[PDB]
Design a protein around this motif. Sequence first.
Motif, PDB file in Angstrom:
ATOM      1  N   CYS A 220     -14.897  -9.956   2.244  1.00 37.14           N
ATOM      2  CA  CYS A 220     -16.035  -9.058   1.996  1.00 37.14           C
ATOM      3  C   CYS A 220     -17.120  -9.724   1.141  1.00 37.14           C
ATOM      4  O   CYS A 220     -16.846 -10.643   0.374  1.00 37.14           O
ATOM      5  CB  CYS A 220     -15.560  -7.748   1.364  1.00 37.14           C
ATOM      6  N   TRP A 221     -18.344  -9.229   1.277  1.00 34.85           N
ATOM      7  CA  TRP A 221     -19.536  -9.891   0.764  1.00 34.85           C
ATOM      8  C   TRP A 221     -20.408  -9.023  -0.136  1.00 34.85           C
ATOM      9  O   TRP A 221     -20.537  -7.815   0.064  1.00 34.85           O
ATOM     10  CB  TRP A 221     -20.391 -10.380   1.938  1.00 34.85           C
ATOM     11  N   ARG A 222     -21.004  -9.676  -1.131  1.00 39.18           N
ATOM     12  CA  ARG A 222     -22.072  -9.100  -1.948  1.00 39.18           C
ATOM     13  C   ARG A 222     -23.140 -10.160  -2.218  1.00 39.18           C
ATOM     14  O   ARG A 222     -22.872 -11.365  -2.173  1.00 39.18           O
ATOM     15  CB  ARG A 222     -21.522  -8.544  -3.270  1.00 39.18           C
TER      16      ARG A 222
ATOM     17  N   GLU B 119     -18.427 -13.756  -2.315  1.00 35.17           N
ATOM     18  CA  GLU B 119     -17.429 -13.304  -1.368  1.00 35.17           C
ATOM     19  C   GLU B 119     -16.051 -13.268  -1.999  1.00 35.17           C
ATOM     20  O   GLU B 119     -15.787 -13.923  -3.010  1.00 35.17           O
ATOM     21  CB  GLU B 119     -17.450 -14.129  -0.067  1.00 35.17           C
ATOM     22  N   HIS B 120     -15.197 -12.455  -1.400  1.00 39.31           N
ATOM     23  CA  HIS B 120     -13.789 -12.415  -1.750  1.00 39.31           C
ATOM     24  C   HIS B 120     -12.981 -11.829  -0.594  1.00 39.31           C
ATOM     25  O   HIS B 120     -13.524 -11.225   0.320  1.00 39.31           O
ATOM     26  CB  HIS B 120     -13.576 -11.620  -3.048  1.00 39.31           C
TER      27      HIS B 120
HETATM   28  C1  LIG Z   1     -15.845  -8.618  -6.124  1.00 39.46           C
HETATM   29  C2  LIG Z   1     -16.562  -8.300  -4.848  1.00 39.46           C
HETATM   30  N1  LIG Z   1     -16.669  -6.997  -4.535  1.00 39.46           N
HETATM   31  C3  LIG Z   1     -17.276  -6.640  -3.380  1.00 39.46           C
HETATM   32  N2  LIG Z   1     -17.340  -5.319  -3.111  1.00 39.46           N
HETATM   33  C4  LIG Z   1     -17.811  -7.596  -2.483  1.00 39.46           C
HETATM   34  C5  LIG Z   1     -17.706  -8.936  -2.804  1.00 39.46           C
HETATM   35  C6  LIG Z   1     -17.087  -9.297  -3.990  1.00 39.46           C
HETATM   36 BR1  LIG Z   1     -17.016 -11.136  -4.451  1.00 39.46          BR
END
Ligand SMILES: Cc1nc(N)ccc1Br
Lengths: 414, 414
Positions: free
Chosen positions: B107-109, B115-116
């Motif tokens: 998942c991405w921000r 990402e993680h």
């Molecule tokens: C810690 C995190 N939380 C999200 N919701 C998306 C990417 C990441 Br990196």
Amino acid sequence: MVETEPVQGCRDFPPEAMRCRRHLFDVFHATAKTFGFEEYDAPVLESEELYIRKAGEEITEQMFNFITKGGHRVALRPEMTPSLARLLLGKGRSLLLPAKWYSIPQCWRYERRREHYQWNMDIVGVKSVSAEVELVCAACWAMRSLGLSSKDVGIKVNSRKVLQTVVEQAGVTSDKFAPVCVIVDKMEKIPREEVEAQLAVLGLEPTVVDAITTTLSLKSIDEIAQRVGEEHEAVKELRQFFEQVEAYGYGDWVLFDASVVRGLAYYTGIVFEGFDREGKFRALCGGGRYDNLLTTYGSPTPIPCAGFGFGDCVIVELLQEKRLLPDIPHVVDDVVIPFDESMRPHALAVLRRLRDAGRSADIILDKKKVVQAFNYADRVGAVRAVLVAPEEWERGEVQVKMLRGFAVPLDRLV
Amino acid sequence: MVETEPVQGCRDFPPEAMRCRRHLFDVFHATAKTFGFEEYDAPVLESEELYIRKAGEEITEQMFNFITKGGHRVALRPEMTPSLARLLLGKGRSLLLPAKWYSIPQCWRYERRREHYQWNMDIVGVKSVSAEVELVCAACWAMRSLGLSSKDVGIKVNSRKVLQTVVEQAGVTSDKFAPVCVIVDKMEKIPREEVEAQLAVLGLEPTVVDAITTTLSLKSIDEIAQRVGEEHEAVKELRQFFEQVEAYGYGDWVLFDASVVRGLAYYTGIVFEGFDREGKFRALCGGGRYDNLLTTYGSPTPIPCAGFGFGDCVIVELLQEKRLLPDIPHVVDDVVIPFDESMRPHALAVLRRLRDAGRSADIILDKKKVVQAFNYADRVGAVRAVLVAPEEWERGEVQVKMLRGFAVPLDRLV
Ligand SMILES: Cc1nc(N)ccc1Br
Ligand SMILES: N[C@@H](Cc1c[nH]c[nH+]1)C(=O)O
Ligand SMILES: N[C@@H](Cc1c[nH]c[nH+]1)C(=O)O
Ligand SMILES: Cc1nc(N)ccc1Br
């Protein structure tokens, strides 16, 4: 309603479809482990720099790219090999060689489907054709493990060096060699007249083309030898290649095809393609040797490389066609059925015992009648239904029934 | 040189780092299989629609999004749950319930890492707290499987219904309840005075806040009962919850914390968080019940749901801190060493036999001296070195040596 369909060109994988994908990926993993490769990963999102090769390639042409808010050039990777190169190059003298690295990245294109998974296998630090031999045997191995045989498929093999010799002797500066492969790669797909015209556009002359087509249509290694020599690199290589594959036990899977070039700029030597022996499908997989990519990326010393990509789509079509993709139904070992809510605490302790012993088990989570619970157990493909009833619990027992109803002690459950 | 570092905020996974990630993912998979969940996947790239909830959420605020060339609104998913909902909703009456689905999406921000990976586990079609019980026990199970104990970690549990009752009795239209949770979720992170001011901005009055903080700082289920009733949904639920977790054998892992709300808009009932018992790290995992998401997405009938996310970063920090992440060195069963190039064809046949029997084996691919080949075998963590020499081959034998040198027949190798 919100839109329930996925974004343009992308697949959803509900449990049914996911079991099919695992079936395949399992083999890619197991094969890789069998052949001693090491898994790696890198980000799907790379810098767009990494893919500007300028050889009119289909993969660079059809690139899923965009700009961040910060103004940086990025792109969803169209292939893995450049990412690999970055990684290998990031490690300097510290990377032990030879190295054998694999991965199963999702890759992207913009245009028809826009994503796919591609098993990647690459060998780094091996000058000799033993690497290509290993890679080709890995692809066969995987296909064999999926139930396919050398009657069903094979792998066409060639060397770009042959055509390199012919191109060079035609006076053509070596810079032209990458675009020439990318054009000639379209020889199968599009007609003879429309390939000629591409080479004319990139400044090549007519007699130099004649020799290209003729050598493309040469049917044997002996015929190549006639044209270039028996101790030309390519002939020695290919004989070594076929001799080694022969010795490993996969000679029926491999064969020489002078028309095989692949559409990627970076291949320097041996190249190959998987195909079905009925002529129905596109390439199952594709690869080759690329000894100058890392020099191109700025490595102070050239690093020999070879590898392949094996997509997730064609293989499936083929496996369906050959009736080798049966529905994989869901399975779980145990479904634990409390007689009623008063037996839940006890059903949990049972659930805990079963799981502790490495068994896969559900417990009925909603309030439901025993026969409905048992139906459910069948529907989710439970091997066994374990009923926790008050009369049996008082005796230190449960009622077990095999789906594919006896009183059983708790210890004896596992 | 090309840029060897990955794109801003993204991790590379060379083989060493990948072995660490597999160690973790293996547990997520094994746990999921132990608990009977079914794997699924969907595209990382979703329509931006799917994440416009308007409750001032951190996850929607920090969204990695962009426009295709076609002008369509898309985004790299910040979480999985909306994708799940789309899938579940795409299947109408045809989805058998209850359903237990899991996945490990990247998942991405956009902003610090961007990402993680996040293990997702969700249960669909179960009204009762038995679902939350199962989910919470799954998270513990996973952590236990990584070597952690209830001395090291636990899972704080609450219900949003308590605060719902209190908010409603304050005259506050039920629309305000989602933003109130998202603000109060910041109670731990940021100071008392700066949370108050957020609630004042969204039109809430002073006496209604008093009751919020007081109930947030209530220390027991009995204290909640005093304030709301002993057969309020929440009290019955939570007692059932703790009673069930108690019965499954994980009571030492779970505890009540009235301050737990989570930062997501969609949670309706029970909610939970993993944490280390030393107060060092952020939330290990997080989840809850979300019975109205699918109604919100347009389901003609409401579908009960519950689930959690379990990130790939904090767990690792914690496992490192507790010395529970030893280097996983590479292993392969056999390395096959041809005495020299004339023994290669024979070494291949050996290689083929070993692999046929399910063993992981390499064969030395470059031309190298026996002692250098043997060093290599040690470096890549071979359990066994298999030397193919001419004197032994003539006798139908090879020389085997265990690393963790005897003459052995070919049949007897496996
Ligand atoms: C810690 C995190 N939380 C999200 N919701 C998306 C990417 C990441 Br990196
Ligand atoms: N990147 C190639 C496959 C490959 C891997 N290694 C070398 N070649 C492709 O997309 O076809
Ligand atoms: N989507 C949530 C986790 C979750 C899964 N299911 C329900 N909640 C998160 O990112 O924290
Ligand atoms: C078939 C394919 N090839 C690529 N190179 C990228 C995405 C897809 Br889909």
